[PDB]
Amino acid sequence: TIYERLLEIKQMNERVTKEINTRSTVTFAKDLDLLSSQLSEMGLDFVGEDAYKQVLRLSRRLINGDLEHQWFEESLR
Amino acid sequence: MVYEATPFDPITVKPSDKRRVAYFYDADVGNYAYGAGHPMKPHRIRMAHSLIMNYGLYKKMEIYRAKPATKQEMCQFHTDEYIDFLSRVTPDNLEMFKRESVKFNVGDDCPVFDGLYEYCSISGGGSMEGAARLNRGKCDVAVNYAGGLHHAKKSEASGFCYLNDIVLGIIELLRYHPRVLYIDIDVHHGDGVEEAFYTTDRVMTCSFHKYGEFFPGTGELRDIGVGAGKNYAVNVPLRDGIDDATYRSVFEPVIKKIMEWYQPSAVVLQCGGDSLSGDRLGCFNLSMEGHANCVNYVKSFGIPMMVVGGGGYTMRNVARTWCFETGLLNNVVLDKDLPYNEYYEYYGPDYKLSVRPSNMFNVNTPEYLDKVMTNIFANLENTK
Amino acid sequence: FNQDFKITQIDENSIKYDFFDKIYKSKMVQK
Amino acid sequence: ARTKQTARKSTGGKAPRKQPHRYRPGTVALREIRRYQKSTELLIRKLPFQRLVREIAQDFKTDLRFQSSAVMALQEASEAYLVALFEDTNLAAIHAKRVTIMPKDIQLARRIRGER
Amino acid sequence: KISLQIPIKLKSVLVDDWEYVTKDKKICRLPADVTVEMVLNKYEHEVSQELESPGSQSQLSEYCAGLKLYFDKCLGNMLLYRLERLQYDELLKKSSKDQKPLVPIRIYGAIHLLRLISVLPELISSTTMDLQSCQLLIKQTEDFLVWLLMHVDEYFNDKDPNRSDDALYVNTSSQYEGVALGM
Amino acid sequence: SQDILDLDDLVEKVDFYLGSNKELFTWFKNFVGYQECEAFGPSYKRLPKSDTFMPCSGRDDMCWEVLNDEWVGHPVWASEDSGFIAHRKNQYEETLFKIEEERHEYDFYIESNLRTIQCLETIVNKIENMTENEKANFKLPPGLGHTSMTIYKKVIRKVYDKERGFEIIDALHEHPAVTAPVVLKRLKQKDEEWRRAQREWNKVWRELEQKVFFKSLDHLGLTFKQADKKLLTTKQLISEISSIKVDQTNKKIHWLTPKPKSQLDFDFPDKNIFYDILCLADTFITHTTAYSNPDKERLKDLLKYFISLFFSISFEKIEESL
Amino acid sequence: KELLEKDSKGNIIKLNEPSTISEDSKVSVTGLPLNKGPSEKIKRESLWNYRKRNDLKTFLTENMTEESNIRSTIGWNDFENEDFCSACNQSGSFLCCDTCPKSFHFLCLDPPIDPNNLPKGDWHCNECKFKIFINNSMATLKKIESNFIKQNNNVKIFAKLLFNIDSHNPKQFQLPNYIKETFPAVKTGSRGQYSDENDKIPLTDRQLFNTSYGQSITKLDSYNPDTHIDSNSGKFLICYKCNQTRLGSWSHPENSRLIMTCDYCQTPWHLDCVPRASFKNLGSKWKCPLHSPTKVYKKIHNYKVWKKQRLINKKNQLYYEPLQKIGYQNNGNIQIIPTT
Amino acid sequence: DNIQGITKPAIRRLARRGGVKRISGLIYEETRGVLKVFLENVIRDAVTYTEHAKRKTVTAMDVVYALKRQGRTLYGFGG
Ligand SMILES: [Zn+2]
Ligand SMILES: [Zn+2]
Ligand SMILES: [Zn+2]
Ligand SMILES: [Zn+2]
Ligand SMILES: [Zn+2]
Structure with a gap:
C-alpha cells in the first residue's frame, strides 16, 4: 500500500516537477499582489526542489510532528 | 468492442478549417439577475x-447585437398564452397571475424578475440571428452565449429556462437546411429541445448528460424518438x-458515427458550462480542455455550426471555458495567462x-x- | 364473484409440455 | 370573499426542480420519588443544558466561552432552584385539596416567594 | 350496517381507475364513446324482457331513473378525483359557452357510474332510509353489477393512451397537472 | 405458451436469464426459431388531439410539420412524483458558492448602475448644449432611448425609495430637465460608494478564496483519512483477496480450465521506493515514544532484513542508500 | 411630499430628493448593506491574518457591434379557517367559508370558482348554505324532506338520497375501504394517491441531505465495498449476469463495479450488466430483468394487452388446480406447485 | 429551540426530586420560561463580571459570584 502510494507520486514526479518549476505567474496578479502570500511563507511551495524528494521530506516532517496535517495536505494539493 | 480507453490528446486547431465567426452579444444581457439566492446568473x-x-x-470575428425577438417570433415554438404570460408578468403583479404561475411553472425554480421578457427576447433574437446568418452564408460559426435555454418547453418554464431559443434557432436553420444536428454537452438532458424535435427526422438531437435521479429525469437510452423521428434522438447517459479522456472517448465516436450516418447540414452545439468540474449543480469532472475538445472536434467536420452557450452556474469556470471555446473557433489556442479584465478578481488564485x-x-x-x-451505434444504423 | 380471479395451480412439467407443444405448432405451421 | 394561501408555493412539483403485571398510576411515581430523592446526580442531561446556556448567553456577549465547571455550576444552580420551586409548588397544590401541580400553582408560589 | 356485493373484477376495475387517476395521472376521455345513460339504458332494455312482471318493470325503470338523477346531482359533489375537477370545470365552461346546461348522463362514462355504485352504501347509511328501501336498492344495484360482468369487456377495456386514441383514459399535460394540483 | 408473450420479448427474457451460458442460450435461440418497432421510451406520453390544438401564432406549415406537440415529458413524471437527488458539495464548495454569490450581487448592482449612469450622462450632455426655451417641453421616451426598458427602472427603484421610485421614473419621463442631473449625481455617488465597498469586500473574498479553493476542489482527499482508517484494516484486505478468489472459483466451472495459481498481482518497477519507505519507517521509529529502544532497534533490523531477504536488494545497498 | 415644485404658471423649478436612507441600509446577501464593507467579526476568519492597469479593451465593443435583423421572420412572421382543503385534504390556495371554519380549493367546489371571478361579498359553503336555508324556513327538516319526496313522485327510492346531498359539502371522491381491503398490496399515500408493492418506502430527509460528504445515497462519490457483502450472511453478492463480484481493492478502486440488489427477489446485479447509471434510491422499486412482467403488449398482425390479476387477500382468493394438464388456457395468471 | 432541549421527562425528573406526584401537562412549558428567565439573570450578571475582568471567557468562579449577588450562594465550585 505504501509502495503503490509512493509509486503513483514518483511515476508522475517529472511532469509535476516540470509544471511547478515552469509556473509562469500572470503579471497583474504580481503587480496587485493577488497571489497567496502564506503559501511560500511556510516554504510549502515545491519550487526549486524535486517534487518526490520534497514529498518525502514533507512526510518526514509530518511524521516527526513539526508539520501540521492541514499544511501538509494543502502543500500536497 | 466499441468503447476504447484513449488518453486525452492535447487540443490542436486545424489551419485548413478557417471559419468566419459571428459573435452575438447584447450588452444588456448581464444586467439581468434571476434572484438573490439563485444559481443561474446572466452575469x-x-x-x-x-x-x-x-x-x-474581436479582431478575428464580427460582433453583432441581435434584434430582440417580438411576441410572435417566440410563438414559432411556444404557445400564445405562454408568451403572453411571460411578456406581462413582473414581480409586482405576481399575485395577479396565480393560475398561470402553476400552469406555466413560473414562480418557483423559475422566478419572476422584472427583466424576464427582455432577457428572453435577447436570447431568442441571438439564436435566431445566428441561425439566419448561417443560412445566408454570412458566417460559418455563429456564437451566441446569450441563449442556451434548452429546458424550456412549449407551454412551461423549467430548469431556469423560459424561452427555448435553441428550438427557434433550429427552426430558422430548417428553413434553409434539410438536416440539423443538435448536440448537448450540458450535464442536464436537453429535454425541451429533444421533446420539440422528438417526432421528426429532420432534427437529430444528441444529448451527453448525466442520467441518474438528476434533473430533468428524462434521457433514458431507450428514448430514441417516436413516429418519423425514431432513432433520431440519441441519449447518452x-x-x-x-x-476529459473518458468524455472524449465517449463523445468523439458517437458524434463521428452521427456525422457519417445522419449527415447533417447544420450543427447546433449547446455548450453548457455545468459539465465542468466544480459546478454548483453539475456532477461531472471536465476540465476546460475537456469541455472545449467537444467544440474543437465538432469544428473539424466543416459543417456550418451554431455555438450556443447554455448552463454553467459557477461564473468563473463557464466564462473561462466559453472564452477558450470561442478562441478555438478562430483557429487559435489562447495562452493560459488571463489578461486584465474588469472582473479579474473572480479567477483566483492562479488567475x-x-x-x-x-x-x-x-x-x-x-x-x-x-x-x-x-x-x-445499433440505433444509428437506420439513419442513413 | 371470487371465481373470476381464480389463480391456476400449474406444475413445471405441464409448463414444459405446453411450451414444447406450442413451439412445435408454431414452427411447423410457418414451415 | 376571504381567501388564504397555504401551499406557499408559486409552482407545483418543487421537488422535481433544478434548484401483564401493571402497577396502579402513582406507585411507580412514588418509587422514583424515592429514587430521585436518595440520588444526587444531575437530572437535566448536560449537553442539552450547556446549549441552553450558549444560545441564551449569546445575547449578553458574543464569543463567550464557558469554563466547563461553569456550565456545571449553571446546572447545579438551576436544578437546585427548580427543586426548591417544585417543593413549593407541591405545597401550593396540596393546599388546594389536590395532588397535581399546575401552572397556576407556580405562578402563585413565585408571587409569595416574591420572585415576581 | 349496509353491505354491497361488488364483483372483484369491477373492484379491480375501480382500483385500476384509482391507479390511473392518482398515480399515472390519467383522466377519462370525455365525452366517452359509451356514456352512463347509454349503459343504464342498455341494461334496462336487456333486463326488461328477462321477466314478465309489470311491478318489477316499474321498479327497474324507477331504479334506472333515480340512478340517472343521482348521478347528475352528485357527480359535481363527490364522484371525481381532484385531478378530474379541472376537466369538470372546462366542461362546465364549455357548456355555458353554448348556453346548454351540463348533464353528466350524456358526458361521463361508465367508470364514474361504477364509482357511484361503489360509494353508494355510504350514502345509503347517511340518510334516514327505511330497511326495505335500502334492501331493495342494494338488490337492484347488485343485479346491475352482475349485469356489468357480462359486458365488462365492452365498457371497461384495457388500452394504452400512448398507443390507441380509442382508449378510455387519456394522458394529461403538465399545464393541466399544474392547474389541477397546484392551486 | 398462452399466446400472450411475443417471441421477441421471450428471446429477450431468456437472454437476460441465460446470457452467460452461450451454448444453452443458443440451443434455445434456435431450438426456438428466432431470426435476427414502436419503442416509445419510458419518459414520454402521448397527449390527445384535444390538447394539441393550442394557438401558436408564429407557426407556419413547416413549424407545424417539424415540431412535436403530442408527445411530452416532465420532470415530475420522470421522478415518479418523488423528487431529484442533488449532488453533494463540500462545505468549502458551499462557501465558494457564497463568495461567488456576494461577488455577483455587488457586480450586478454596480454594472446596472453604471449602465444607467452612462445613459443618464448621455441625456445630460445632450440637454446641456441647448437653451431653455425648448428645454421645458423636452420629454424622454420609455427606455430613455436605450435598448432596455427595465434596467434604469430597476436602478431607480433600488437607489431611491420603493414608493418614490415610480414617481421619480414618471418625473424623469415627463420633465427630465430638472430630474436628470440630480438622478445622475445620486447614481454616481452610489456608484463610487458601492465600488469602494466592493474593493474592501474584494480583499476579503480573495483571501477566503485562497483559503478555501484547493480544499473545495479536493473530493476524495477531504474524506481520505476516515476512508483510509476504515478500509486499510485486516477485514477489508482479507475481503479483497477472498472476493478475487471467489470470482476465480465461480468462473472456473464455466471456462478457463487452466485455473490461475494467483489472485493478487503486485508490480515493483522501482527499487528506490523501498529505501524511501525504510527511511519513513526509521523516522517513525526515531520519533515515537510508545516503543522501547530495544524494541525500536529490533524493529529497524527486522524491516531491513525482511526487505533485503524478500526482494533482490542486498543489505549493503540498503545501508549505503539509507 | 411635493416632489415637483411647480411655479405659478406650472413651470418646473427644482425637485427635492426623497428618503435615500429609507432603504440605503437594506441587508444584502453578504449580511451587510452595500453601503458598508465587511465587519471585523467576519474579517477574522476570512482574511489570513487580521490585526486590531487600465489597458482595457472591453470599452471598444459598442463600436464594433453591428445590429442584426436579417432573419426570415423579421418585421412580422371569528375562527381561522383550516389550512387544508375540506374536499381533498391537501394544501393550496383556498376559498374560506365566512360563517364556517372549513376551507375549500377553488377547483374543489361545485361549480368550481374561478380564482379571478370571485364572489363579491360573502361566500358560504354548501353545508352552511343549507343551514341558512333551514333556519330561514319556518318548517323543520323532515317537513322539507317529505315535501321533496312527494313533489318528486317520479323517483321514490332515490329521493332521500337526492335530498341529503344538497346539504353535504363537495368532497374529493375516495374509494371505500372494502374496495381497498380486497387487494392487500394496494396502499394509500399521504395525499390519498395510489400506492402498491411497486413503490419504495419514501426516504426521509435524514438520509438524503443529512448525510456526510463522502457517503451519499447515490453511492457514486466514494468507494464503498460494504455493498458487495451480504449483511445477514456475510457472503459476497455475486452478480447474476457476470457471475462475479467486483469488490475492488482500495488501491485500484476503479476496478470495483457497482452492484445493486433487486427490490423484489434480492437478486444482485452489476450496474453494467443491466444497463443502468442510477442506483434507484427513490421513486418506484427497481425490478431486475428476471421477473415476469405484469403488463405486456402483443401485436395482432391493432394489438392486445394483458395485465396480471392483482393480489387478493386469503379470504377472497381461490387457488384451484386444473384437471387438464396440457393445453389448459390459463389467463397467464398461474401458480407453480412442486413437482412430485 | 435549545430551550425545547429541556425535555419533558427532564422536567418530570425535577418534579420527582421535588416530590410532585402528578404533573399537569401545561407545567412543562411554564417551567421552561421560568427556567430561562432565571438563567437569563445569572448568566447576565455572570457576564457583567466577565467583561469587568476583560476576560472573554467566563469562569465557574464568576458563576457562583453572580449567584452570591442574586442571593443564592452555591458551595462546591470555588470561592
Ligand atoms: Zn444544464
Ligand atoms: Zn360553512
Ligand atoms: Zn381541494
Ligand atoms: Zn455483473
Ligand atoms: Zn430481481
Whole structure:
C-alpha cells in the first residue's frame, strides 16, 4: 500500500516537477499582489526542489510532528 | 468492442478549417439577475465576453447585437398564452397571475424578475440571428452565449429556462437546411429541445448528460424518438465524475458515427458550462480542455455550426471555458495567462485560463459506456 | 364473484409440455 | 370573499426542480420519588443544558466561552432552584385539596416567594 | 350496517381507475364513446324482457331513473378525483359557452357510474332510509353489477393512451397537472 | 405458451436469464426459431388531439410539420412524483458558492448602475448644449432611448425609495430637465460608494478564496483519512483477496480450465521506493515514544532484513542508500 | 411630499430628493448593506491574518457591434379557517367559508370558482348554505324532506338520497375501504394517491441531505465495498449476469463495479450488466430483468394487452388446480406447485 | 429551540426530586420560561463580571459570584 502510494507520486514526479518549476505567474496578479502570500511563507511551495524528494521530506516532517496535517495536505494539493 | 480507453490528446486547431465567426452579444444581457439566492446568473455572459475583448479576439470575428425577438417570433415554438404570460408578468403583479404561475411553472425554480421578457427576447433574437446568418452564408460559426435555454418547453418554464431559443434557432436553420444536428454537452438532458424535435427526422438531437435521479429525469437510452423521428434522438447517459479522456472517448465516436450516418447540414452545439468540474449543480469532472475538445472536434467536420452557450452556474469556470471555446473557433489556442479584465478578481488564485478538474471518482466504467455506445451505434444504423 | 380471479395451480412439467407443444405448432405451421 | 394561501408555493412539483403485571398510576411515581430523592446526580442531561446556556448567553456577549465547571455550576444552580420551586409548588397544590401541580400553582408560589 | 356485493373484477376495475387517476395521472376521455345513460339504458332494455312482471318493470325503470338523477346531482359533489375537477370545470365552461346546461348522463362514462355504485352504501347509511328501501336498492344495484360482468369487456377495456386514441383514459399535460394540483 | 408473450420479448427474457451460458442460450435461440418497432421510451406520453390544438401564432406549415406537440415529458413524471437527488458539495464548495454569490450581487448592482449612469450622462450632455426655451417641453421616451426598458427602472427603484421610485421614473419621463442631473449625481455617488465597498469586500473574498479553493476542489482527499482508517484494516484486505478468489472459483466451472495459481498481482518497477519507505519507517521509529529502544532497534533490523531477504536488494545497498 | 415644485404658471423649478436612507441600509446577501464593507467579526476568519492597469479593451465593443435583423421572420412572421382543503385534504390556495371554519380549493367546489371571478361579498359553503336555508324556513327538516319526496313522485327510492346531498359539502371522491381491503398490496399515500408493492418506502430527509460528504445515497462519490457483502450472511453478492463480484481493492478502486440488489427477489446485479447509471434510491422499486412482467403488449398482425390479476387477500382468493394438464388456457395468471 | 432541549421527562425528573406526584401537562412549558428567565439573570450578571475582568471567557468562579449577588450562594465550585 505504501509502495503503490509512493509509486503513483514518483511515476508522475517529472511532469509535476516540470509544471511547478515552469509556473509562469500572470503579471497583474504580481503587480496587485493577488497571489497567496502564506503559501511560500511556510516554504510549502515545491519550487526549486524535486517534487518526490520534497514529498518525502514533507512526510518526514509530518511524521516527526513539526508539520501540521492541514499544511501538509494543502502543500500536497 | 466499441468503447476504447484513449488518453486525452492535447487540443490542436486545424489551419485548413478557417471559419468566419459571428459573435452575438447584447450588452444588456448581464444586467439581468434571476434572484438573490439563485444559481443561474446572466452575469456570466459578460465576464465571458470581457475575456473575449481583452484577449483581442474581436479582431478575428464580427460582433453583432441581435434584434430582440417580438411576441410572435417566440410563438414559432411556444404557445400564445405562454408568451403572453411571460411578456406581462413582473414581480409586482405576481399575485395577479396565480393560475398561470402553476400552469406555466413560473414562480418557483423559475422566478419572476422584472427583466424576464427582455432577457428572453435577447436570447431568442441571438439564436435566431445566428441561425439566419448561417443560412445566408454570412458566417460559418455563429456564437451566441446569450441563449442556451434548452429546458424550456412549449407551454412551461423549467430548469431556469423560459424561452427555448435553441428550438427557434433550429427552426430558422430548417428553413434553409434539410438536416440539423443538435448536440448537448450540458450535464442536464436537453429535454425541451429533444421533446420539440422528438417526432421528426429532420432534427437529430444528441444529448451527453448525466442520467441518474438528476434533473430533468428524462434521457433514458431507450428514448430514441417516436413516429418519423425514431432513432433520431440519441441519449447518452453518463454517471458522475467523467473526466476529459473518458468524455472524449465517449463523445468523439458517437458524434463521428452521427456525422457519417445522419449527415447533417447544420450543427447546433449547446455548450453548457455545468459539465465542468466544480459546478454548483453539475456532477461531472471536465476540465476546460475537456469541455472545449467537444467544440474543437465538432469544428473539424466543416459543417456550418451554431455555438450556443447554455448552463454553467459557477461564473468563473463557464466564462473561462466559453472564452477558450470561442478562441478555438478562430483557429487559435489562447495562452493560459488571463489578461486584465474588469472582473479579474473572480479567477483566483492562479488567475489563469485553465479550469482544474477535481480528483473525484470516474465511476463511468468502460463496460457500461461500451454497452451504451453499442446500443447507440445499433440505433444509428437506420439513419442513413 | 371470487371465481373470476381464480389463480391456476400449474406444475413445471405441464409448463414444459405446453411450451414444447406450442413451439412445435408454431414452427411447423410457418414451415 | 376571504381567501388564504397555504401551499406557499408559486409552482407545483418543487421537488422535481433544478434548484401483564401493571402497577396502579402513582406507585411507580412514588418509587422514583424515592429514587430521585436518595440520588444526587444531575437530572437535566448536560449537553442539552450547556446549549441552553450558549444560545441564551449569546445575547449578553458574543464569543463567550464557558469554563466547563461553569456550565456545571449553571446546572447545579438551576436544578437546585427548580427543586426548591417544585417543593413549593407541591405545597401550593396540596393546599388546594389536590395532588397535581399546575401552572397556576407556580405562578402563585413565585408571587409569595416574591420572585415576581 | 349496509353491505354491497361488488364483483372483484369491477373492484379491480375501480382500483385500476384509482391507479390511473392518482398515480399515472390519467383522466377519462370525455365525452366517452359509451356514456352512463347509454349503459343504464342498455341494461334496462336487456333486463326488461328477462321477466314478465309489470311491478318489477316499474321498479327497474324507477331504479334506472333515480340512478340517472343521482348521478347528475352528485357527480359535481363527490364522484371525481381532484385531478378530474379541472376537466369538470372546462366542461362546465364549455357548456355555458353554448348556453346548454351540463348533464353528466350524456358526458361521463361508465367508470364514474361504477364509482357511484361503489360509494353508494355510504350514502345509503347517511340518510334516514327505511330497511326495505335500502334492501331493495342494494338488490337492484347488485343485479346491475352482475349485469356489468357480462359486458365488462365492452365498457371497461384495457388500452394504452400512448398507443390507441380509442382508449378510455387519456394522458394529461403538465399545464393541466399544474392547474389541477397546484392551486 | 398462452399466446400472450411475443417471441421477441421471450428471446429477450431468456437472454437476460441465460446470457452467460452461450451454448444453452443458443440451443434455445434456435431450438426456438428466432431470426435476427414502436419503442416509445419510458419518459414520454402521448397527449390527445384535444390538447394539441393550442394557438401558436408564429407557426407556419413547416413549424407545424417539424415540431412535436403530442408527445411530452416532465420532470415530475420522470421522478415518479418523488423528487431529484442533488449532488453533494463540500462545505468549502458551499462557501465558494457564497463568495461567488456576494461577488455577483455587488457586480450586478454596480454594472446596472453604471449602465444607467452612462445613459443618464448621455441625456445630460445632450440637454446641456441647448437653451431653455425648448428645454421645458423636452420629454424622454420609455427606455430613455436605450435598448432596455427595465434596467434604469430597476436602478431607480433600488437607489431611491420603493414608493418614490415610480414617481421619480414618471418625473424623469415627463420633465427630465430638472430630474436628470440630480438622478445622475445620486447614481454616481452610489456608484463610487458601492465600488469602494466592493474593493474592501474584494480583499476579503480573495483571501477566503485562497483559503478555501484547493480544499473545495479536493473530493476524495477531504474524506481520505476516515476512508483510509476504515478500509486499510485486516477485514477489508482479507475481503479483497477472498472476493478475487471467489470470482476465480465461480468462473472456473464455466471456462478457463487452466485455473490461475494467483489472485493478487503486485508490480515493483522501482527499487528506490523501498529505501524511501525504510527511511519513513526509521523516522517513525526515531520519533515515537510508545516503543522501547530495544524494541525500536529490533524493529529497524527486522524491516531491513525482511526487505533485503524478500526482494533482490542486498543489505549493503540498503545501508549505503539509507 | 411635493416632489415637483411647480411655479405659478406650472413651470418646473427644482425637485427635492426623497428618503435615500429609507432603504440605503437594506441587508444584502453578504449580511451587510452595500453601503458598508465587511465587519471585523467576519474579517477574522476570512482574511489570513487580521490585526486590531487600465489597458482595457472591453470599452471598444459598442463600436464594433453591428445590429442584426436579417432573419426570415423579421418585421412580422371569528375562527381561522383550516389550512387544508375540506374536499381533498391537501394544501393550496383556498376559498374560506365566512360563517364556517372549513376551507375549500377553488377547483374543489361545485361549480368550481374561478380564482379571478370571485364572489363579491360573502361566500358560504354548501353545508352552511343549507343551514341558512333551514333556519330561514319556518318548517323543520323532515317537513322539507317529505315535501321533496312527494313533489318528486317520479323517483321514490332515490329521493332521500337526492335530498341529503344538497346539504353535504363537495368532497374529493375516495374509494371505500372494502374496495381497498380486497387487494392487500394496494396502499394509500399521504395525499390519498395510489400506492402498491411497486413503490419504495419514501426516504426521509435524514438520509438524503443529512448525510456526510463522502457517503451519499447515490453511492457514486466514494468507494464503498460494504455493498458487495451480504449483511445477514456475510457472503459476497455475486452478480447474476457476470457471475462475479467486483469488490475492488482500495488501491485500484476503479476496478470495483457497482452492484445493486433487486427490490423484489434480492437478486444482485452489476450496474453494467443491466444497463443502468442510477442506483434507484427513490421513486418506484427497481425490478431486475428476471421477473415476469405484469403488463405486456402483443401485436395482432391493432394489438392486445394483458395485465396480471392483482393480489387478493386469503379470504377472497381461490387457488384451484386444473384437471387438464396440457393445453389448459390459463389467463397467464398461474401458480407453480412442486413437482412430485 | 435549545430551550425545547429541556425535555419533558427532564422536567418530570425535577418534579420527582421535588416530590410532585402528578404533573399537569401545561407545567412543562411554564417551567421552561421560568427556567430561562432565571438563567437569563445569572448568566447576565455572570457576564457583567466577565467583561469587568476583560476576560472573554467566563469562569465557574464568576458563576457562583453572580449567584452570591442574586442571593443564592452555591458551595462546591470555588470561592
Ligand atoms: Zn444544464
Ligand atoms: Zn360553512
Ligand atoms: Zn381541494
Ligand atoms: Zn455483473
Ligand atoms: Zn430481481
